[PDB]
Design an enzyme around this catalytic site. Structure first.
Site, short mmCIF file in Angstrom:
data_model
loop_
_atom_site.label_atom_id
_atom_site.label_comp_id
_atom_site.label_asym_id
_atom_site.label_seq_id
_atom_site.Cartn_x
_atom_site.Cartn_y
_atom_site.Cartn_z
N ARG A 223 0.82 -1.21 0.00
CA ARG A 223 0.00 0.00 0.00
C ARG A 223 0.86 1.27 0.00
NH1 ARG A 223 -2.97 0.13 4.77
NH2 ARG A 223 -3.59 -2.02 4.29
N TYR B 233 -12.99 21.71 -13.29
CA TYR B 233 -13.46 20.47 -13.89
C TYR B 233 -14.76 20.07 -13.16
CZ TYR B 233 -12.94 15.48 -15.25
OH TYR B 233 -13.09 14.20 -15.74
N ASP C 231 -5.09 22.45 -10.26
CA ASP C 231 -5.22 21.27 -11.10
C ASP C 231 -4.41 21.71 -12.34
OD1 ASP C 231 -6.05 19.38 -13.07
OD2 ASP C 231 -7.94 19.08 -12.00
N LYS D 17 -4.03 11.97 -18.49
CA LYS D 17 -3.95 12.78 -19.69
C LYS D 17 -2.58 12.74 -20.40
CE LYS D 17 -8.25 13.49 -18.91
NZ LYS D 17 -8.66 14.51 -17.94
#
EC number: 4.4.1.13
Lengths: 391, 391, 392, 392
Positions: free
Chosen positions: B54, B107, B181, B206
């Site tokens: 993790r 967004y 962002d 992206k």
């Protein structure tokens, strides 16, 4: 027919396209042929139509279908790991001012999430003894929103009397969401949903993957809770990659033959330990005299290979090193549910620290074992040698 | 030297072991050779020592190192996707009673997370115009904990005057956490951290991945915010799989040659559109007359290939279908930052719905384009043909 | 239309992508038949793109095969585990005991060894020719010559063949010979082999197609005449590549154009700088005037990749070699090339002479082979310059 | 110690796992050398497990190779793209024009085709023998016999060789022959080939080792005598397998024991049921008394896998065949086997007779080959029973 189900779950031609296993569709962008196509996909974005990578691809859909049929739920939500599944499933249903009731034998990270994250968002958490049964009513509050179970409990292995707990909760706070971390049973040895539990959570990382090389969490829900969990987990951006989804579906295929060996080998080891001079107590759900064994006997259809035992003496640092550092087959590591055997030691003080509003009832060092797929006699020989090291 | 950095970032021998790329270490369980080893790994669990899946493996460490050097941060936190990075980064710093100030051009999913999740946890959110600059002080409250920026803005492409905004915030609420962002700039065309921003978030999904076949979010932090973000995201069980980490590091290697082509082709298309009879306005940061172009010119070192333009007329449903359904090279799909060209249309009413406390200033249909790696002349020919379809 | 548009779309049909941008990855050995009728249909089209058995391929392989035929203009594409396998198995597919193989002496070393170590024991003989032989290749032709194997530019030394002259000469003498070319340097797109009368174009996709040095695969694109024989004989040899590697290769194609352009631009700048350097005897770069076969490259190719070599004026000794090679900061020593990073390797004249059968080398100094990656060119020149200082 | 313990630990050393439970996946063609000294050291140990070049392998391949040598007790393990490639290339590695190959007539069809279609054109002849020939194999030996190829149990018909008798007979006549065996059915562990004097044990790891029908790979474990020749000649043919497939195969080994035990238990129960069925003429299962070579299996093997066949009393026509095969709910029709699911395929006597060179078949009814997976055995028997009803 469980074995038959495990081999066929989620393998529709729509997902395999001629192959035995589902195809692996890696994607963020999913293309719409026309405006009409886009509108249709949009309308069915949460209903198995290709829309966007975050919602999933054919690979994810295949796994979700398999999990719903295996655990008997209305839907399956996927997460990056078991810890994310726990934290996000709880978060999906709470609101400022709510109360969360959790077993004190819950996996440590689950407890920490409640005490460190939820607390700052105006949510309070209190804990209860695993064996409380119907008396859980004494802990229920008007604002109790979630009741969180974990059977068998982490490390100490106590088994809850689920039917008694569920009946008590429903009678007092019908609207509460009851969840259970069903990792030890791999979701199949205890059909949580058939007991009135709303959400069955699993660290698929454990037995479903079965090879210690992938991390993923799953939450199978009944019809009542599916929509809220699905949409809220989606707003938190929870999802797992396509390859891990493929690996998890693949792990399901050998789940039956694996669990059977884990069950047989761990029980043999447990019975051997139970009669050893240096052992004070054996915590294995399938072994008589273990806490809640009566409930395991009644509600479960089997056992996996994780359990613990308590030594008669508390080892000091030198003894600990000498004991642990010299095993030939058992390895020290976190996690479990794989093909190899593991060993971890916990001092009584360490456990007491993670048993909120509860008390420990042993004084010797506790040893947690995961019994893998090695020859059981070789494993017993290794343990026998270890005891001689601390005699 | 950016090109040189992109090729070498994170490629220490410790991670590659002789190969060009880092090895892929798939794991949940990480083995400790001795008790001494376990104790050491424990102590350095958040400091690049193998401890538990993790936390990450060598593959994750390599990517984190590359991201920190590329964006100039103290640490890098990994997420399942960009949406998880946004939601969890915000969640890591808020507390019941806080206020979040977010640009209204953010967004959509980021906005929804605030209005649907944070609201029920006693956190309030208000929005601001992207071009407000120093006047943002009028929106700051004593309890403003986070100021969330996105430049260029989603869909409409407005560029903020970051220096003006940061100075204003620091003067009024020094303790606030300022986040951005930074997906459009792929974190390299705008060095957010050099402007006083605390956390730079990216949907690596992206441009970093660049091939539309993986999802992952990254958050690079300064020294002030790293520890809290890292530990809180960890309690929420956030992580990304090893293979996706490998794929992201791999995408960095061609980031330079890709961004250069996207920049050149998109600008050529933009200038062509700017002179077309059927076009009302072109929203490209690198094109004069675009909102905030002056700031892009001053603060960025380049452009990617996503932008939008507004038609002179608002197309009806039949016209929309006829326009969109017949492109030969452009495909309709969500996401962007890949090697292929994409097209999406948005009606004015749709945008107005996602511009909280703001107002739209156009009446024609808006078309968002992602300019891929195809021959730019073939793309222009396709667009030209499309206009003829709606003439 | 144009190359860049073709690279982005090649092989990406709905049948393979199923809604996604890239082809799906279908991992399989067993492929299920719904009915006896379906099995019959599959059996008949087992070599025509119908799902039959994993060894023949799955949707993922079919997508790549289609992309390759489109890019190189062939009738079919055969896949192999690596480039060396593509070379060895393509030659084996067409020979019989008693045949003769004519190969350029500048061929990749492993290709030469295959002929001299394996073919020799199966009753097949191999002779060699100089890369610049041109129309005079007729002198080396024999009545039993079955295969003429080309490689342009040549391995290490970079000589460019006058292919039109060679093909026409061979055809005038042995019309039915099988002409093959290892077209790895041009990545199959900078030199359209099949348009020049060549029967089979072979590539170590391991290099530029993959472009990231993390996968191995060989491809052979054939004309209509040779497809069935190569396909079926390679199949009997159990040649195939895994689904994931096929996916990664298709993926590599998407950025091939932007990558090759940068490799071309940067290597030429480095070559020109080296050409004017006091310690450099000669630069072997196809795009550089004066280089062997430059006029053929100028005439037949549409671009250049980033691999080339140069000869130092001196032949370095062991101490000088280590000091030079061991201290580079950007260039790494490793085999293979075509990736995003810069590599460097040194060869002594005597090493090369040993692998130039029936030929003479034309230099006496140490030869350095360079692969120019995607790093900033000025940083690369600086690293090289520091290298020269360790030698002065 | 015991088999199960070996399967869990084989090849899992720290050098390959680096702290994880499973070996790391190192994808690569290029392997970087830090210095000239390092390169020299790597070159000298390129075939001894030192990182040199992707075609030779990476840490991932080395881990599997070590696991395989340990499991089958060999000096070395050579990897191939699939089982068919392992067979074709292993044979090719040892032959020269003029040699003779002696192969069992029950060999996997593709193996037979390799000999008759490829070897024949390279001046190598192949003859065949009956599986139960035993010590009488001496009659088929020739002075130029280089390879004796075994396959036990045989493909489809399941005949078990009397290996000890065959090996001793061959050695008494041609001491230096290379004896090979396609040991796929036993997964290399149910029959320890190398302990019986066999030189090379070949497996289509594609079957039981992978065990999930989603990867293809061939392995050849050799004794000290044949290792170098097989390794180097296969290398010249460019034979290798990708890193990810090597990882998946190593991973498959971990559950091989629990899987094989279930396959053994379930198939025997199905075989015994079939044996007592009115519509069944004969059951070809090595573990079943009366089956061809049963006493050899009982004596030489340590277990059984889940593949076997049976002969129906009648020879079904096209209509009956479709009605029977098309309506199964649990059994699927597909090639390959060794996975977790049950498969079914039918063959007519005439089909088999065509692939039994220099031999006669011993049945006249339709033959059904079954692969018993991991489904509940009672569900499987029910599906089969419903199948018989569609035929009565």
């Amino acid at each position: 027919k469980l074995d038959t189900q495990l081999v066929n779950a989620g393998r529709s031609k729509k997902y395999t396209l001629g192959a035995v296993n589902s195809v692996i569709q890696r994607a963020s962008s999913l293309v719409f042929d026309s405006v009409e196509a886009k509108k249709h996909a949009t309308r069915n974005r949460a209903n198995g139509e290709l829309f966007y990578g975050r919602r999933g691809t054919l690979t994810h859909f295949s796994l979700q279908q398999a999990m719903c049929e295996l655990e008997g739920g209305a839907g399956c939500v996927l997460f990056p790991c078991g810890a994310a599944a726990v934290a996000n499933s709880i978060l999906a249903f709470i609101e400022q001012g709510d109360h969360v009731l959790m077993t004190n034998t819950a996996y440590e990270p689950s407890q920490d999430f409640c005490s460190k994250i939820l607390s700052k968002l105006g949510v309070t958490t209190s804990w209860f003894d695993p064996l409380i049964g119907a008396d859980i009513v004494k802990h229920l509050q008007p604002n109790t929103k979630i009741v969180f179970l974990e059977s068998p409990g982490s490390i100490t292995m106590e088994v809850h009397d689920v039917p008694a707990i569920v009946a008590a909760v429903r009678s007092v706070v019908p609207d509460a969401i009851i969840m259970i971390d069903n990792t030890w049973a791999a979701g199949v040895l205890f059909k949580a949903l058939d007991f009135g539990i709303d959400v069955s959570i699993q660290a698929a990382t454990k037995y479903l993957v079965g090879h210690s090389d992938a991390m993923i969490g799953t939450a199978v829900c009944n019809a009542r809770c599916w929509e809220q969990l699905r949409e809220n987990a989606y707003l938190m951006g929870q999802m797992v990659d396509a390859d891990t989804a493929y690996i998890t579906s693949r792990g399901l295929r050998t789940l039956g033959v694996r669990l059977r060996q884990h069950h047989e080998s761990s029980l043999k080891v447990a019975e051997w330990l139970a009669e050893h001079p240096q052992v004070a107590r054996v915590n294995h759900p399938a072994l008589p005299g273990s806490k809640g064994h009566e409930f395991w006997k009644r509600d479960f259809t089997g056992s996996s290979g994780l359990f613990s035992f308590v030594l008669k003496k508390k080892l000091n640092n030198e003894e600990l090193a000498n004991y642990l550092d010299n095993f030939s087959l058992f390895s020290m590591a976190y996690s479990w549910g794989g093909y190899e055997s593991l060993i971890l030691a916990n001092q009584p003080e360490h456990i007491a620290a993670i048993r909120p509003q509860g008390e420990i009832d042993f004084s010797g060092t506790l040893i947690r074992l995961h019994i893998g797929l090695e020859d059981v006699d070789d494993l017993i020989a290794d343990l026998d040698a270890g005891f001689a090291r601390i005699v």
